Every structure is written in C-alpha cells, then in structure tokens.
Design a protein around this ligand. Structure first.
Ligand SMILES: Nc1ncnc2c1ncn2[C@@H]1O[C@@H]2COP(=O)(O)O[C@H]3[C@@H](O)[C@H](n4cnc5c(N)ncnc54)O[C@@H]3COP(=O)(O)O[C@H]2[C@H]1O
Lengths: 76, 81
C-alpha cells in the first residue's frame, strides 16, 4: 500500500486541471493519496484539487499504474 | 506518518454495505480516499468506483483523525458513542 511518487515537471495538457476534471482513476488506474505543492501537502485531495507543474503526486496502484501515470504526465 | 492508511473492519450492519464505492460516493460522504479493500483475505489496491464493500471487509483509507471519525460513523462503528 506504499505510494508511488512522481514530480510533474514536464509540460503537459494535464497540468492546470483538477483531479476530477482529469478523471484520473479512469485515465491511469491510479488513486491519488496526496499532492505536494510548494512543499506543502494535501492528503485525500478530492476532485477539486488542482495539479500544477512541479507538484508531486503520491498515488497507489501497481507497476502498470505507475507506468500509465508517467506516460500520462509526459515523464518519458 | 500522515500518509499511513487507517484501517476499519466493517463488521456492523449498515445501509452502506453491498454497495459500490461510486454508489456510496465515499470521498464526498466522509472525506476519505480508499486505497485498498481486503475481502476474504484478498487485497484490491486502487479499487475504483465499481469495487463493492461487503460486511467484514477491511477498508484502508487516507485522511486525518476527523476523516477517520466520519468513516467510523458512516459504517455504524460507533459502539453506542
Ligand atoms: N478510492 C476512492 N475513495 C473514496 N471515494 C472514491 C474512491 N473511488 C471513487 N470514489 C467516489 O466515487 C466517485 C466516482 O469515482 P470515479 O473513480 O468514477 O471518478 C473520480 C476519479 O476518476 C477522479 N478522482 C477523484 N479523486 C481521485 C483521486 N484521489 N485519485 C484518482 N482519481 C480521483 O474524479 C472523479 C470524481 O471524483 P469524486 O471524488 O467527485 O467522486 C468519486 C468518489 O466520491
């Protein structure tokens, strides 16, 4: 149940959007447990939390979900 | 730490049992983000809206102490308090 962490530092059409707007679980299979933004954490973020460039996304899933999240945010 | 999941065993009768996470709309009801369900000793991680919560399952979720209190009340686990 340990979360993966990615840093969304690359340009992506998925930045500047809320978790619900992206519909993250349906896009990547990931359940986001926290967002780190400017060194501050929001746990259990809900659909209205926004993912901005440079933020850290903590999420649960398997290795395939990790791969989907990386590709989805242009981290390849 | 703060991202460590809470664990509740939904052992009491509840109108919410036999429903999917999406039907319950869990995050909007309790503030909790469910990370896994344990059912018959088997774990589903990142369960999504179609996973069903059945009596006796263990629900693992992130939140704070207040979210825990909401989940416990929501699933009829208050033990008379
Ligand atoms: N693991 C879970 N724990 C707690 N509740 C859960 C849940 N999975 C689903 N739900 C609840 O069911 C609703 C629909 O979930 P769905 O995954 O289809 O649709 C979700 C999902 O695609 C996405 N989403 C929201 N929060 C997410 C998160 N932390 N991680 C990944 N995707 C999320 O935005 C959509 C709307 O989310 P919203 O919270 O308004 O509504 C969610 C939520 O109330």
């Amino acid at each position: 149940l340990a979360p993966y962490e990615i840093i969304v530092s690359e340009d992506s059409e998925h930045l500047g959007k809320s978790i619900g707007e992206l519909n993250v679980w349906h896009q990547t299979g990931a359940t986001i447990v926290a967002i780190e933004h400017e060194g501050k954490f929001i746990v259990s973020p809900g659909p209205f939390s926004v993912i901005e460039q440079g933020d850290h996304i903590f999420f649960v899933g398997d290795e395939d979900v990790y791969a989907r999240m990386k590709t989805y945010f242009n981290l390849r």
